Symmetry: D2
Subunit: 187 residues, 4 copies
Amino acid sequence: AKVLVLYYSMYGHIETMARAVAEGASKVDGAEVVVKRVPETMPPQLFEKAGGKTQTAPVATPQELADYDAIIFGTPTRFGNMSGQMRTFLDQTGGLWASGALYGKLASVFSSTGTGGGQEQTITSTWTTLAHHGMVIVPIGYAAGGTPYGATTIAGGDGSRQPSQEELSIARYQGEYVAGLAVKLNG
Amino acid sequence: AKVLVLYYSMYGHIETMARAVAEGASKVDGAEVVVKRVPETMPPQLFEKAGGKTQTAPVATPQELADYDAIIFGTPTRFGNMSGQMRTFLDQTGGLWASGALYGKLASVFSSTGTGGGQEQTITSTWTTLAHHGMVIVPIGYAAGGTPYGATTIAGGDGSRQPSQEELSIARYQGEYVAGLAVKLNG
Amino acid sequence: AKVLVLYYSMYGHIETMARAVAEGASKVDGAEVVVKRVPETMPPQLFEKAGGKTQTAPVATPQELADYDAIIFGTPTRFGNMSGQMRTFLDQTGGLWASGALYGKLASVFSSTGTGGGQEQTITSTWTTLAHHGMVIVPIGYAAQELFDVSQGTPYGATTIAGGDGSRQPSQEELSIARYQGEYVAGLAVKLNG
Amino acid sequence: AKVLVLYYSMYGHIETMARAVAEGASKVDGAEVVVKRVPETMPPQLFEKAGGKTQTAPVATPQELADYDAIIFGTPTRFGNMSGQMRTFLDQTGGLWASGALYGKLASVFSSTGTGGGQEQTITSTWTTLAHHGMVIVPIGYAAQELFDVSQGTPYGATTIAGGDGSRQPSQEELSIARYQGEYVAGLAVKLNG
Ligand SMILES: Cc1cc2nc3c(=O)[nH]c(=O)nc-3n(C[C@H](O)[C@H](O)[C@H](O)COP(=O)(O)O)c2cc1C
Ligand SMILES: Cc1cc2nc3c(=O)[nH]c(=O)nc-3n(C[C@H](O)[C@H](O)[C@H](O)COP(=O)(O)O)c2cc1C
Ligand SMILES: Cc1cc2nc3c(=O)[nH]c(=O)nc-3n(C[C@H](O)[C@H](O)[C@H](O)COP(=O)(O)O)c2cc1C
Ligand SMILES: Cc1cc2nc3c(=O)[nH]c(=O)nc-3n(C[C@H](O)[C@H](O)[C@H](O)COP(=O)(O)O)c2cc1C
């Protein structure tokens, strides 16, 4: 089964989580794992002014999402929604929608946040879009700051540092668990 | 694989939908289907005053939910949430939660509504509880009044009549599709 | 303006928060503040065996919600929804809905959780119902620090952590935010209604 | 009171609804009403090829949102969320968030959909962001029939159906509800701010 970890990061928190998700997924024998990012939509000079961390993962196209049995989506919490970049990207998947291309495939969501709240709403509002595509939605439940909706990191914004070891463990779990389901369903 | 259709109905709309869901599930060779209701919490005299339709399906206990590979939950739209009866029932599943008993099992949701709106919020707010239990959430997507979140019936409240043939077809689809996934995952 | 703080509590956490909300509301001259609870639905023997806490607040009826200008709703988080007791109570507001009785009145929500997870969904899923009644929804955002009586969460409404075992009590930081919510909502109620 | 109707539209459906909202708002004496759009993010050539509609409204900046008492946000439904254009615009409100600039101001939301599905989630997921800014959320409920200029949906905000092919235009029933929303929000804005 093929697993895509697909993410948006501006300051590297989701980037770090994505690597952990992918490590977890790669523990599953039957699973082929790939990590890609959605495009940055901000002009590089605006990204740099804002202090962004340049992302180097390969860039996904909207249409290649069809190639995978499971897609694990990472986004920062942006006032309780996914980022504009992820939203712009998903707004480009209309052509898949029309064809059923993601129907029945597994979807799961991870996030990162400051200490203001909103991470639950980010994850569940991202589910909604995934449901329009007919994707099967995988929460993490009581595996575990924490939500049962998906892994999170609390990045205590500004002088910000880094995901905790416990946070990265839960992120690894989410990838291992999603990948295991993907192999059960698809070989 | 074992499939439970679990529902709450006061005026029979969800009752009618549940039968359709179960017909759909029963089309799947590997699937064993059972229909049960959550208890009515209103005193019978209060139910009758309100014009309720007496429900006769067997009553589920909260703990027997553990026996099934997939659970398809039906609730009327009540101001954009599940009914108090379904909420009281799910509030009794704490003992399962604690043990992981529903973790990884499939969950899906259907609803009924008047013409006021709220059906989307009823379905997605019910998902949230299912996620706390670690259940895998199955939307219906573009199979289809309609929502991709789950089957609905628009019961145009008062002088109310009945689910449409197209509505009942989508409800059958939801059971067939959920049951098919349950057999893929569990035999 | 008349402000109702309407709550459900099994183990006292929301009760403590309700009292805080009401204290904040009472700071507003011209706000008349009342605290009531929704009925317990569990048999008393079961409530007692479970260690539920007895409470002095008067029990609300659904009808009387019409008599206020603002209603601040408190509920524990039950798997990311309001409690079955609050849901069952709100399901008895159909007659009010049909007459418009709560339309345009102010509404706000507070919660409690064991370990954090779900609190945002509890608050926003309760907003849904408030919107069907046409109530004006008041989130708390991140208010100016000087408006809190303790020097310092969610923007959706005040919350408290009860711990995994239920033994934690609300901190003065948490209670300060609850007091702020009541004062802020009551302030708006008087601005709109005298 | 100053009321901003701030919208995104690709094919004109939300533009038509915005104009309706503004017409309703303008009925309130003392309400100063302004309509602006968020910037298009697609390259113009791609917008044109896709059949996007050109529009006269002035383009808003994020900063100027601070200058209003009420903001009524319009967005098409994009898989049950606001559009990437509105999301990208709101993600540029961090400086306003940090200064409190929108706190306590009134907010309300309207939408459009192709075939119905998702509209409720678009509106309530936009409320989330408004709450992070501490805005007072105004749903429309089911208002008294006599307040609509056409004799007669969701309670969360006005909506319109564009059809599967995008060719449907908003009905006078739908537009009446949009006009109501603007008049009702503007009325509240003047009650609160003069
Ligand atoms: C536009 C904007 C909105 C934000 N909204 C929230 C929020 O609602 N709650 C929160 O706690 N943090 C919020 N933050 C902080 C980010 O979620 C946080 O810094 C996250 O760790 C960044 O992930 P990244 O490094 O992958 O970009 C927001 C940041 C931005 C830029
Ligand atoms: C307390 C209450 C709340 C209601 N809320 C809504 C609503 O938000 N939107 C709606 O369109 N209908 C609403 N209705 C109507 C019911 O969803 C509808 O009648 C449904 O078909 C009943 O299903 P049942 O026959 O299975 O009870 C509500 C009804 C009740 C009693
Ligand atoms: C059925 C049930 C479900 C619960 N779900 C959650 C949950 O989703 N998240 C959580 O952190 N705590 C949860 N709790 C813990 C409660 O939120 C906690 O008991 C409550 O906040 C206490 O408030 P009270 O003392 O006013 O009853 C749950 C408790 C029960 C009984
Ligand atoms: C990426 C995308 C996703 C969409 N998702 C939905 C949907 O979830 N539900 C729906 O009914 N229509 C959906 N539509 C149709 C739009 O909501 C419709 O084009 C929009 O309401 C038109 O408003 P406008 O003319 O102002 O752009 C979608 C359109 C696009 C381009």
